[PDB]
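Hi there. Long-time user, first ticket. I'm pasting a complex I've been working with (about 425 residues overall). I'd like to know whether the download I got is complete or cut off, because the file seemed smaller than I expected. Thanks.
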Amino acid sequence: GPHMATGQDRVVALVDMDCFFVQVEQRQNPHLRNKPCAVVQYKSWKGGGIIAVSYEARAFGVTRSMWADDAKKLCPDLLLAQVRESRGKANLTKYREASVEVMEIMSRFAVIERASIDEAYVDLTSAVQERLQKLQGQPISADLLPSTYIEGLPQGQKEGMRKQGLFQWLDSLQIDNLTSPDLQLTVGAVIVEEMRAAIERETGFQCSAGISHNKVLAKLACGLNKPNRQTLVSHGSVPQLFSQMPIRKIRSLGGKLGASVIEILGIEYMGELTQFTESQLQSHFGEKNGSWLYAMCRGIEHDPVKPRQLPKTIGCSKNFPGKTALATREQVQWWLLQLAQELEERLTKDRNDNDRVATQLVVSIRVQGDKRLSSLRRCCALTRYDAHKMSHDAFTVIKNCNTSGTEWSPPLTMLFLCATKFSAS
DNA sequence: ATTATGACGCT
Ligand SMILES: Nc1nc2c(ncn2[C@H]2C[C@H](O)[C@@H](COP(=O)(O)NP(=O)(O)OP(=O)(O)O)O2)c(=O)[nH]1
Ligand SMILES: [Mg+2]
Ligand SMILES: [Mg+2]
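Hi, the file is complete. Here it is re-exported in full:
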């Protein structure tokens, strides 16, 4: 009892820009605001693959990974913005820069771990302590939490329910106890309302957030009430929340490992994991997964919020599916040169903005009819930011995959250059 | 013929 630690030491938030690329296009083109609209890559094949969808279009069934021509069947009024194309490929510069805007605002409040182009984790522990001392026992008003949902409440119209749950929670709060985890979460949620208001004031972008004691619960919480809302998942809400939560919904159990948990153990929901000893879990799933699962199904996770606002690698990738697969030497060279030219542009801007140089170049390729998503992956040294040198070295490092007797076989369905191993500059 | 990425683990 007294010695079972409960993983209530930290306050952690996950902030996700809602349908981010769509919002970027809607800020730039006001004729898209508050309409069903989606963002697409390419236009020739079935109107393009959709990678971002507004909530209005979602109301009609439009999803990511869907062809635009199919989305139009579900939503005939759908508006489409095209990703920029440079050197024959998609170019996401507009959104990486919009993302830097957002991250830079978030960093004013706390240390943030860039988790993706549009979402970060926040370690609010110190900020909550500072703010708690600032209040000096003063009670927390519902006015400070105008968009917060308390998961599990009310107990015993959507905004009406929300306010009821918030009132029940705030009435129960022990404000005089500067060490109660629930109070600390509440204060973190006040600070996240402030962060979200600053992001929207200074960018016009709206976002959702989850507030809890760890990254996995913050991420799960973030998803309970979207869009433009935030959800506080308290330690005490976990047993009910997890009692019907499909295992696949927890970050990192969405794939094969979550499938084998389901199949081997014979369960469906996260909470059912509590009925297995740690050793049993370790035995089925390895020592790391086992320890991690034994703690996670009790709402405990220790992965730290890593202080990292910049990506660790910088990458350029283009698929060549179907009959478009590259089949000659000239083709592989020209696309390696296109890939390297964009890579070089991104790298020079990275060196100048962020004072660092990449030292290693990873070349990945897929070949046609190869099952795997990397038919090959080989590294070479990255010594200068020269597109022609980088493309030439990538070719030198893959060329012994050609089996022709000027021709290229097996045909290539993917080229991919990645710059890694950054050293300060 | 979702694509374009990017973190992270295993060996
Ligand atoms: N090129 C590409 N971009 C992608 C892909 N997946 C996502 N993006 C881009 C487009 C997305 O806008 C952005 C962020 O991805 P999310 O946070 O997963 N989705 P969003 O912010 O759209 O909606 P929500 O309110 O549910 O969070 O990343 C992809 O497979 N390929
Ligand atoms: Mg998002
Ligand atoms: Mg995201």
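A couple of notes from our side: The domain at 12-18+94-239 of chain A is CATH 3.30.70.270 (Alpha-Beta Plaits). Residues 41-42, 45-46, 48-51, 64-67, 83, 89-90, 92, 115-117, 288, 311-319, 321-322, 324, 416, 418 of chain A lie near DNA strand B (CB under 10 Å from a C1').
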